Amino acid sequence: DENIEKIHLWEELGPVGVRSIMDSLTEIPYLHTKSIRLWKVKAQDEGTRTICNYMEKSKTIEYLDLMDNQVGSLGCEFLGRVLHPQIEIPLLKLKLDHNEFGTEGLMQLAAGLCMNSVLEKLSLNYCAITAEGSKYIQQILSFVNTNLKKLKMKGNLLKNEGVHQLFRAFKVNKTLEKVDLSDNQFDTTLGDDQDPEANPNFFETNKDAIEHNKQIIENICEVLKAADTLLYYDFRFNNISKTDAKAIIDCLEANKNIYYMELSEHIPKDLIERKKGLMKKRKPKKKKKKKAKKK
């Protein structure tokens, strides 16, 4: 005599099957559902629109999970439209990993989600989000209204321009808690061009890229210094230079509230040890689950 409050399945359901299931859900007053998790069930456009109609008719779904489901452009259109702010949708945490929707999909989401005010955790990792589309996220951070928690940006094509735009946005953002941008092709190290005698003039022409990277790292330092809330970071599988590593090490010294961070593996080993030792003091104290004596 229980109800379907959380859904978690891992088998492909087919567009016809998913559509019929979700439309039957919509036509049934089933408001007990609170979470649904599917990886690669491939809801796609039709399934996504079905869940959108169900959500708008019921307005009771709170958790969702759609990784590796191959959500297309029209699927992102549905996701953006159903996420309107007058819908009053109870969705809590959103995740669309393994979905190469790109800039088109990210814009379709941002249609309503760029200024949406519902979720807690939204993940789009391994989505190859293009750097240009990061402008949309730029509009999300410049907003002064802020009661969301998480944003995952690992494994996309945001790149150096994306990181600069994100840090510009952070310059005004005062409430971000955890951010993950690793594995995003972000190239800080110029490369192996460390023997100048091989190319004597390589320094003269290399003015824009190096100055831009130094500006990016300086903005990173300023954001981390002024960041009174953001304390979770991930830079794994990224191209982070040793000089940038040492600069970040020196800069983070002032902001000691950061309870977790990540850096690329090829950063200086001594700098890695220094960062680990410094952040050891910053680990949050695990709050014991208060076990109320049932009576």
Partner: protein, 101 residues
């Protein structure tokens, strides 16, 4: 029976409907609806006019205007407001952008 009471003075305790999601977006709704006013009430002509006028104002193309230039833009649109309150509003919004001039 026997008038064994008993009325209860129902004090609505502040322990219901506490928001759960701390610090990224969830207030985004309010201003969004406010935006819909100029996402509704206003013709796009004034939107384009203000876009171009500010881009003219944004001499450095930084999307931002300082105190003097913000008063510039307000006056150019025929805004008549006391110095003080506009000053506090600008200060609040600059606090919302601590790392932006």
């Amino acid at each position: 029976m026997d008038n064994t009471g008993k009325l209860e003075k129902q004090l609505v305790t502040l322990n219901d409907g506490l928001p759960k999601k701390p610090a990224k977006e969830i207030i985004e709704e309010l201003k969004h609806h406010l935006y819909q006013d100029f996402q509704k009430f206003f013709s796009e002509e004034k939107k384009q006019q203000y876009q171009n006028n500010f881009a003219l104002f944004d001499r450095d193309n930084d999307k931002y205007i300082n105190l003097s230039e913000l008063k510039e833009l307000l006056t150019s649109v025929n805004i008549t407001f006391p110095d003080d309150e506009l000053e506090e509003l600008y200060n609040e919004f600059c606090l919302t952008s601590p790392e932006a001039d």
